[PDB]
């Protein structure tokens, strides 16, 4: 199964499902990217779900895109509930163009569907020679630190920066202890789950994933603050639903998700030598790899290197 | 020892001018330290004055910095700080970011070659008081193992955020990227007391419950804090062409030498994206709704992020700021260090 195989497979199915071929090819690209890195939970597995939402109009197959520039370094892509992968990619293209010319770009994606493993979009920026940051809202699923009711979602944050040649450092994290898609992956095989992952309906940590009501924020109050930040930057900033108002995947397959995403792109030229920047990123990656491992680890990886390796295999 | 804000400020300002800083630089430095103490961030409060005085005295902090604000684009700049006091340089840089975001919507401003700047949420609060979103981050003394590692590379590399609500309301969030800040290991050293095994590691990279056996801190949330401190080093260090990672200076390396630290501010004007009135209403709504969430057993209340410190700060304005008595005794002395 080659990368070109599934792309064409997914491109075909989604195009049959309603999307323009170009929109279908893009969603395909992002899904193929995800499987390889062990983020299978955002890969070809979701194709059938996406195909459905497309069929029923809960994802716009004919979006009226409007890129509204708001300043020399800012814009909003009004996405009309297009597939998140298409909308986020398109907005990142604008962010890259803007940072290329004017040094920095802050671009909001306003009203999109699920955009997936969001490190795909920051890799776009790094491939263009720039620093990329991205973050987005997600289905309410997480208790506030100390709480028993859900408010924010798993609200991810991603970052990538160019090293020398084709090297890129890519980092991508959910703001919960663990992503949701391995609570079900441990709900499939009847396992106990660790008590750090989730709480019951009373907000008490649980080992029974069938009694899981909500996820816990990573590092307690810190993950809590981070998912708040992401909600404010990609949601409140754009005047979108926020916090517990954010839509859930299964609320209404006929209704647009109205999610927000925010890209920030920085051109190293506008700060220092890009050649030295890239040299120093590669040096960072080398030096971290050479760090003495602690007992229990065979090696130290630079951030994201574990996924970089899985992708190549 | 509870003391008021005007008096703690005056004392710190006096002691740092005595060391050799200009009075207005000392005032700014004092401003940021009393802010930290009032919010309960004591490890970046008045406790640092004695250290600051020695470094100013010995020339490791520039009492006569040649500031140069290099504007690099419509929304970008670098304040070359010539190893000025960190509080002075970071605030100065944030003033430019605010001006820039007012006019052009967004600002990304580096602080290039500064001393320690303290509790960095001070700077993002500047932005929020101006009606803007503020983000800041900076490099710190190498002290932390990479995830899976047994050697030091990054520092406690903090991240701070603030956004305005209605009226005078501000939502402020401010975190070290380690499990715990270094001051908690130091506090355990003062009290002779077992620390949890999740904070820190010995010289072999084995977690230790003995604060005197600590060689390095662990990153918050394993690989996630690791990635965050990397991001911060790249954004506030590598991006600015500064020493990075393990190259970053340590506080007691050379008291006669400039720290050469970096910090990065990012400021976003909500008016360039949507209704700023609705934005502020929505921040205030966020704060109210979170505070109203049903608490888990054990907790009396759910706080919105940073609310614990807002409460301490509110209590500080009434009852006064707490500092350790020995710091007061140093401040009213003629002794510098
Ligand atoms: N609504 C949405 O679109 C959402 C998407 N997501 C995505 O799901 C994924 C979730 O990721 P997590 O489960 O939190 O990832 P994770 O916990 O497995 O790892 C986080 C980061 O640290 C790196 N890392 C992990 N172990 C490492 C090691 N031993 N050495 C060096 N680096 C290491 C990873 O490569 C990754 O960059 C992300 O791609 C995220 O974008 C997550 C939540 C919501
Ligand atoms: N070189 C430097 O300048 C450095 C400065 N620092 C500073 O030191 C401080 C480090 O902070 P940490 O020890 O990580 O803080 P922390 O762990 O006590 O809490 C971090 C954040 O979460 C909030 N929070 C904590 N508990 C909460 C609760 N129950 N409910 C709601 N919110 C809660 C806090 O208000 C704070 O905003 C920061 O002010 C940071 O700027 C840290 C490292 C380096």
Model description:
The structure is a homodimer. Chain A has 313 residues and is of the alpha+beta class. Chain A has two domains: 1-60, Orthogonal Bundle (Hypothetical Oxidoreductase Yiak, Chain: A, domain 1); 61-313, Malate/L-lactate/L-sulpholactate dehydrogenase, NADPH binding domain (Ribosomal Protein S8, Chain: A, domain 1, 2-Layer Sandwich), CATH 3.30.1370.60. Chain A has eight helices and nine strands. Chain A has helices at 3-17, 21-36, 47-55, 84-102, 119-127, 221-234, 274-289, 305-312; strands spanning 66-71, 74-78, 104-112, 131-136, 157-162, 168-173, 198-199, 214-215, 259-266. In chain A, the strands form two sheets. A seven-stranded mixed sheet of chain A has the order 1-2-3-9-4-5-6, sandwiched between helices. In chain A, strands 7-8 form a two-stranded antiparallel ribbon. In chain A, helix 1 runs parallel beside helix 3 and helix 2 packs across helix 4 (84-102). Chain A is globular. The first copy, chain A, starts with a helix and ends with a helix. The interface between A and B is large, with 76 and 75 residues. The structure holds 1,4-dihydronicotinamide adenine dinucleotide (2 copies). One 1,4-dihydronicotinamide adenine dinucleotide sits between chains A (39, 42, 114-119, 136, 138, 154, 156, 158, 171-174, 178-179, 301, 303-307) and B (147-148, 223-224, 227).
């Amino acid at each position: 199964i080659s990368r070109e195989t599934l792309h064409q497979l997914i491109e075909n199915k989604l195009c049959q499902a309603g999307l323009k071929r170009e929109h279908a090819a893009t969603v395909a690209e992002v899904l193929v990217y995800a499987d390889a890195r062990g983020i299978h939970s955002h890969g070809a597995v979701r194709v059938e779900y996406y195909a459905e939402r497309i069929s029923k109009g809960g994802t716009n197959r004919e979006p009226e895109f409007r890129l509204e520039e708001t300043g020399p370094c800012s814009a909003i892509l009004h996405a009309d509930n297009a597939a998140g992968q298409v909308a986020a990619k398109m907005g990142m293209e604008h962010a890259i163009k803007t940072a290329q010319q004017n040094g920095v770009a802050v671009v909001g994606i306003s009203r999109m569907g699920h955009s997936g493993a969001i490190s795909y979009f920051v890799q776009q920026a790094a491939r263009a020679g720039f620093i990329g940051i991205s973050m987005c809202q997600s289905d309410p699923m997480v208790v506030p630190f100390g709480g028993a009711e859900i408010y924010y979602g798993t609200n991810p944050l991603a970052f990538a920066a160019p090293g020398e040649g084709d090297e890129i450092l890519t980092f991508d994290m959910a703001t919960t202890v663990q992503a949701w898609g391995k609570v079900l992956d441990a709900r499939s095989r009847n396992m106990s789950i660790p008590d750090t992952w989730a709480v019951d309906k009373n907000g008490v940590p649980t080992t029974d994933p069938f009694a899981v009501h909500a996820l816990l924020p990573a590092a307690g109050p810190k993950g809590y603050g981070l998912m708040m930040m992401i909600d404010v930057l990609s949601g409140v900033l754009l005047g979108l639903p926020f916090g517990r108002q954010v839509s859930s995947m299964y609320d209404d397959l006929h209704a647009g998700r109205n999610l927000g995403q925010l890209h920030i792109v920085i051109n190293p030229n506008f700060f220092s030598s890009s050649e030295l920047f890239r040299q120093h990123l590669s040096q960072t990656m080398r030096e971290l790899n050479a760090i003495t491992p602690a007992p229990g680890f065979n090696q130290v990886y630079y951030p994201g290197q574990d996924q970089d390796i899985k992708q190549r295999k």
